[PDB]
Design an enzyme around this catalytic site. Sequence first.
Site, PDB file in Angstrom:
ATOM      1  CG  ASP A  15      34.028  76.549  54.218  1.00  0.00           C
ATOM      2  OD1 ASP A  15      33.946  75.320  54.433  1.00  0.00           O
ATOM      3  OD2 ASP A  15      33.040  77.312  54.278  1.00  0.00           O
ATOM      4  NE  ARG A  29      32.984  76.871  57.741  1.00  0.00           N
ATOM      5  CZ  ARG A  29      32.947  78.074  57.166  1.00  0.00           C
ATOM      6  NH1 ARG A  29      34.064  78.779  57.015  1.00  0.00           N
ATOM      7  NH2 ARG A  29      31.784  78.612  56.803  1.00  0.00           N
ATOM      8  CG  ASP A  34      29.320  80.147  53.908  1.00  0.00           C
ATOM      9  OD1 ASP A  34      29.712  79.000  54.210  1.00  0.00           O
ATOM     10  OD2 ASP A  34      28.127  80.388  53.670  1.00  0.00           O
ATOM     11  CB  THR A  35      33.383  77.610  50.182  1.00  0.00           C
ATOM     12  OG1 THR A  35      33.469  76.712  51.301  1.00  0.00           O
ATOM     13  CG2 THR A  35      34.723  78.322  50.020  1.00  0.00           C
ATOM     14  CD  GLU A  37      27.983  73.107  52.728  1.00  0.00           C
ATOM     15  OE1 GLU A  37      28.546  71.995  52.785  1.00  0.00           O
ATOM     16  OE2 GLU A  37      28.233  74.039  53.528  1.00  0.00           O
ATOM     17  NE  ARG A  75      33.268  73.174  61.414  1.00  0.00           N
ATOM     18  CZ  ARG A  75      32.419  73.728  60.554  1.00  0.00           C
ATOM     19  NH1 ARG A  75      32.308  73.240  59.321  1.00  0.00           N
ATOM     20  NH2 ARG A  75      31.732  74.803  60.901  1.00  0.00           N
TER      21      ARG A  75
END
EC number: 3.1.31.1
Length: 129
Positions: A15, A29, A34-35, A37, A75
């Site tokens: 992401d 971002r 939300d991917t 980690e 970001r």
Amino acid sequence: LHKEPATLIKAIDGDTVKEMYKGQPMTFRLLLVDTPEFNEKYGPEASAFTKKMVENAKKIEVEFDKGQRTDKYGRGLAYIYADGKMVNEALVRQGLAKVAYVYKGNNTHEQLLRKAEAQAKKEKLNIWS
Ligand SMILES: Cc1cn([C@H]2C[C@H](OP(=O)(O)O)[C@@H](COP(=O)(O)O)O2)c(=O)[nH]c1=O
Ligand SMILES: [Ca+2]
């Protein structure tokens, strides 16, 4: 909202993507997702998905929402498109991201993404499996 141009600098993970925007390098971002980690389950696969998506595209575009455009880490916050297809939505549709971080300023495409998540969930895709 409207699409603006950018060119890939480098895929980072599921992401986050480094892109050149108005001629300046910056890390984007992806809004509303939300991917996991890289070190978590489906993290490698998320990163791989986004990477192929942005790397294969002849045209990368960036779409800011109505609220803030930079997060507290500097970001960029945007919807990113690859040849007109939205990476944020595509991740969610494949169960490689959750809808997340939905702040009141920046939520134009929430319902679109939630619709995608519902379908991913139905199919028991990846994260939902
Ligand atoms: C997606 C998104 C994340 N963030 C911040 C909130 C989280 O803060 P904390 O780092 O304090 O938890 C972090 C999540 O990013 P990652 O999921 O990339 O870590 O980035 C925003 O502020 N706005 C946003 O739209
Ligand atoms: Ca993440």
